[PDB]
Amino acid sequence: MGRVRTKTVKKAAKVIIEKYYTRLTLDFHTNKRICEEVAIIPTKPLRNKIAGYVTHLMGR
Amino acid sequence: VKDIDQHAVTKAVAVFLKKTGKLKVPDQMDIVKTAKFKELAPYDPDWFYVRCASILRHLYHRSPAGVGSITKIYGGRKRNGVHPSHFCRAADGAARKALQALEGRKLSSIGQRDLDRIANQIVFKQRDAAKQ
Amino acid sequence: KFQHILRIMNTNIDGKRKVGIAMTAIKGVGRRYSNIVLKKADVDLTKRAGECTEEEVDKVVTIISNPLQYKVPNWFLNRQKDIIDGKYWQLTSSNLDSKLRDDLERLKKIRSHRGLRHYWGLRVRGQHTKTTGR
């Protein structure tokens, strides 16, 4: 509702999923683990976002 | 002592040095306003010596009862001069010499197990006083 | 019981207040002297207003007239260092009321710092009087 997703979490969610949908899981806690691999981040709440959004669309 | 609360446990012991002849009364016990806040005198002297119950836990937990560390922090709950209320220091006076009323340094030679334990023997009797 | 409403010099006493607080109704004495001059005149402070018959309250007048012999020190008085005749007094609506214009009328000749301010009406203790006191 009121927690919309900014550009960087939106414009990186595509560019990892259309590339690394393979060997990717639905489990967010290990989807937490894979974001430090396939890209870099400066901070852990962004991996709380950029893994949370891809998993809020992964079943979709 | 760490028995039941020292409302009345202060009240009994105030009578007992008053009982035992060891009053050692200050000659201006009807003069002083016991600090720079009171509009009236106290009712009587029966607080003035009674804080041996306070030091029995303060020799136990705070310090040897130096008078400067004594008078500052207890008995300050004051409203001073009207713009606005503040804190005090209470400026004791004669109970600097209440060690004589008991007869690195230590402040009591009888409040280890000698005369404090009498008050415990009073409160052990006060257990029997409160037995009905 | 018996009579409650007594009469002392230039005052009166109500029949409800304690003897210490009804002592404050006398001019020139506050609640300081409730423990000071009543126990010095051995008046029991817990006595009600009906009590303290006149054989006891006349000794309080002797503390009023003679405060020095009743173990009242100098730094517990009304006015110290007279300096006129050097004596020390505590005055209860008899001489203190005359003592108001006294020590003012001397300083009119002196025209001191706080002396001549009493003519037009101002404050002798320093406050910025330009704003308040319209």
Add this chain to the structure above:
Amino acid sequence: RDKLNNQVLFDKATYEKLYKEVPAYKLITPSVVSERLKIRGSLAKRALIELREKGLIKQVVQHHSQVIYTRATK
């Protein structure tokens, strides 16, 4: 304007009279005994402390700023 300024006294002329009113008046308290006239405010509490012969009283509230009572209901 209410005044209520009565003779603050031990009130012996009504002491026997306040002795009998407390039965069956179970709402006894320091206000109601001074709500009755010839007002004592403080020693009329003590008047019921003089009623502490375990008769016609039940002192159940003993506190700062209020000591609420009850008559001894049999």
Add this chain to the structure above:
Amino acid sequence: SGGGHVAQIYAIRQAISKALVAFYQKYVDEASKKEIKDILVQYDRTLLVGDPRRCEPKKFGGPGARARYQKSYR
């Protein structure tokens, strides 16, 4: 220590509650740990919930945390 004449005593509610669980969690029994929670958790008065609600810092322009003082002939 700390707290106050109300608040420091409220922490003692968390003190007695968690000690019974931890002594029952490891030493006595699983169901002994269970039988002290279920009768508690019906309403439990948050005897184990340590709310982190502490005081909120000030702001310049006010006397207090969020209030302020105004009407300079606005």
Add this chain to the structure above:
Amino acid sequence: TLWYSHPRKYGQGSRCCRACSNRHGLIRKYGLNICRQCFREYANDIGFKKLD
């Protein structure tokens, strides 16, 4: 020797502003003597990053 009064070791005068020599706006006591408007300029690099 002559015509210089004011035994300056009492009062504000003259323990004044060992960073700008300006009196009426002084931060005196932290061991700074900084004339707080000049402390705006020279906040850095004498630590004093702002945080909150």
Add this chain to the structure above:
Amino acid sequence: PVVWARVMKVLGRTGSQGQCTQVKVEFLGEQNRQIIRNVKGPVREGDILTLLESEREARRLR
């Protein structure tokens, strides 16, 4: 005139000076009258409510 009534659906609250939920509400003995009354103050769904004036509702649309 001691009629009680319980709410089936909230509608909008015209708040600003007199926050009141203009709510559709049916009675208990006359539950076929799902009248749309205006209730000053905070309410929840399924809340039973006392009433006397159960006749007309000060019609305002949305």
Add this chain to the structure above:
Amino acid sequence: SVHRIRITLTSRNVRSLENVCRDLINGAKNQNLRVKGPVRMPTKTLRITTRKTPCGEGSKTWDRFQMRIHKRIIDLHSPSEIVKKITSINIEPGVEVEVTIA
């Protein structure tokens, strides 16, 4: 006979305090200087707050200034001829060593 030399370390950067336990204690417990671990001191935070505008005419805001100073303590039980090499190496910017002789 045998000496105990307590060596306090103060600085501003916690990373430099993480840089002095990076290499000083590791080059000493090879020869067992009895460090007793990294003994943390509570920080000495320094608050200053000032107005913003010189000639303070308008909207009386303020401006808060913070400062963080941190220490960590390394005590050693060794005579003075042992610790002489450790005073030479390693050195660090902004960090201070306080060992007294007499």
Add this chain to the structure above:
Amino acid sequence: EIKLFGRWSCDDVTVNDISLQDYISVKEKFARYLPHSAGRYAAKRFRKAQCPIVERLTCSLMMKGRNNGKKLMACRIVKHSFEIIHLLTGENPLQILVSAIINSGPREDSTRIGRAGTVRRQAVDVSPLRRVNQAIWLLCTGAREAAFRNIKTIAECLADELINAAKGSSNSYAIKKKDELERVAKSNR
């Protein structure tokens, strides 16, 4: 085993008013000894209904500024008032209190901003939350004015509204100022 409110029983206290049942959760779930809860009772909009009542009263009577803030003084004043309400009408004073609280509900109309005008019109029914929580408010005032310049204490003053609101209230008390208000909104209605 859920007993001992302060000195006496807790439950068997029913709310004798449709439609305030199951809304003022008195004692059928929450056997609380004290009027003192700590944490948080207005987080979302829905929190004043899952709570006891004397915890609100002790939250309520701390007012005036010089008395506001102090809940322990409110812990003093109502429990000693509770004995006055226990000694008279020897029924549990909470059963007096729930009968006090439903008669003091302004179960009537009020005033409301017109959707064409000002606060003129009739908020014909009031909310049960505003019915209970203003009923706390309309009695909380009248204890103070019953002891502003009277020598008497608010322990017996607050006992005076509990005895008359439990029954149908007599001539205008703190229990009133609302029944008169029922009339002037019935004038517009």
Add this chain to the structure above:
RNA sequence: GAGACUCAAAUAUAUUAAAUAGAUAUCUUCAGGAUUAUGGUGCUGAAGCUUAUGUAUAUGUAAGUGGAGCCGUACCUGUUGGUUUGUCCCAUUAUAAGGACACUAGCUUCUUAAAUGGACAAAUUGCGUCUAGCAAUAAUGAGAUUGAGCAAUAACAGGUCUGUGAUGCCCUUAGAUGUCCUGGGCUGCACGCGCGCUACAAUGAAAGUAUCAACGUGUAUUUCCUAGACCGAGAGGUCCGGGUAAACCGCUGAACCACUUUCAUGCUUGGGAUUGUGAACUGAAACUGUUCACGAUGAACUUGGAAUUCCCAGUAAGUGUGAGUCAUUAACUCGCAUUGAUUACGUCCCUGCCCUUUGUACACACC
């Protein structure tokens, strides 16, 4: 730009972390109960008591004295010191290991971090334009631990030449506006206006007792923090320390509030302005006063008109304290903690504010 980001107690000590705290453990020592077991003892004179003088009044003893207890231990409840690689070793003046034992005869819960953890949100939910279907439901340190800082383009004849050796220009300079001195004033008053203080009292003013903070701060080219004794109504003063600070002030054992009393609503004992007087402090110097003590002096003031400010959870308000300026002076400003509510969980009437549409005869734009 917003966000992202940086800073703050909740977060496994699971890892190493203490001259903070200590948990503990036992060593203890500070020992009552007889709660214990009693061995000796108990009516036989115990316990308790006085007199005498010596010793420099206490103590010794007898008598005095008196008629049941006495005395030791352990258990129960308390000081203390080390319990740092524990003990016993040693070298050492004494720590350690070296020598073994418990093989742990005190470890890290704890405050402190230096870390990473940390609602880390597919969290299910008759799918809203397949996407941002509130639901409260899931957690059980975590239903944001949660406030701050940060801030673009264009601007204002906003404010600051009196913050600066920032500065154009203007003005002045042995006769200064410069400069140091002695004074004075910036404080003065029929009056108006704003921020703000204690009130106007029984929820109260007194006496008592109980007995909880936190942010901080503290002296080597300046008089700081003060411990301790001591004296003094006080004010203070003396004598002697601590401390450059997790180590001392300081476990800062803050206030309001809790608990019995005095009061008995009566401008009262509410309220302390008001004026005398002395006593004081700081400093060369105190005078609409530098402040401070006492015993007087008790006015206005009884909840404040129209108008009108502030704010949504540890918040509002009550309630202290620290710091900032400071020879002494808060009565204000920043921070700190405590006590802790009511009410909204909305809407655009209100003053509002944001490039949507439309109107114009508006320039310096509805003043």
